[PDB]
């Protein structure tokens, strides 16, 4: 019983990193994982118009994307019909950690 003595709650909304300048986990031209399932590669990284914050225009291999490259008329990258998928970085994961290694 009883959590502790005094407490352990934060005074302000702070995290490991959520106030950097153009910060990001992945980058364009790297293998990622949308929602820890759909495996793709970031083709376009930048803020969209339909939604705030930043997004990753990752392209899929099979016709199963959210859109065909353009979202609500706004285009970001060129991809096959229903291939591009925009998901929050925090929602995306990284698979590769070295473009030139062996």
Swiss-Prot record:
Subcellular location: Cell membrane; Cytoplasm; Golgi apparatus, Golgi stack
PTM notes: Palmitoylation by ZDHHC17 regulates association with the plasma membrane.
UniProt modified residues of type Phosphoserine: 9, 11
Domain CAP-Gly: 46-88
Domain of life per record: Eukaryota
Function of the protein: Functions as a cytoplasmic linker protein. Involved in TGN-endosome dynamics. May modulate the cellular compartmentalization of AKT kinase family and promote its cell membrane localization, thereby playing a role in glucose transport in adipocytes.
Description of how the protein assembles with itself and partners: Homodimer. Interacts with AKT1 and AKT2; when AKT1 and AKT2 are phosphorylated and activated, affinity is higher for AKT2. Interacts with ZDHHC13 (via ANK repeats). Interacts with ZDHHC17 (via ANK repeats).
Entry domain remark: Microtubule association is inhibited by the ANK repeats and the Golgi localization region (GoLD).
Note, other: The N-terminal half is dispensable for proper Golgi targeting, whereas the GoLD region is required.
Protein's recorded name: CAP-Gly domain-containing linker protein 3
Biological source species: Mus musculus
Segment of the intact protein contained: 398 to 486 of 547
């Amino acid at each position: 019983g009883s959590s502790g003595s005094s407490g352990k709650s934060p005074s302000s909304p702070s995290l490991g990193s959520l106030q950097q300048r153009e910060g990001a986990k992945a980058e364009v031209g790297d293998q990622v994982l949308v929602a820890g399932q759909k495996q793709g590669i970031v083709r376009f990284y930048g803020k969209t118009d339909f939604a705030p914050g930043y997004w990753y225009g990752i392209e899929l291999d099979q016709p199963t994307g959210k859109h065909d490259g353009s979202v609500f008329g706004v285009r970001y990258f060129t991809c096959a019909p229903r291939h591009g998928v925009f998901a929050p970085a925090s929602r995306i994961q990284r698979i590769g950690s070295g473009p030139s290694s062996g």
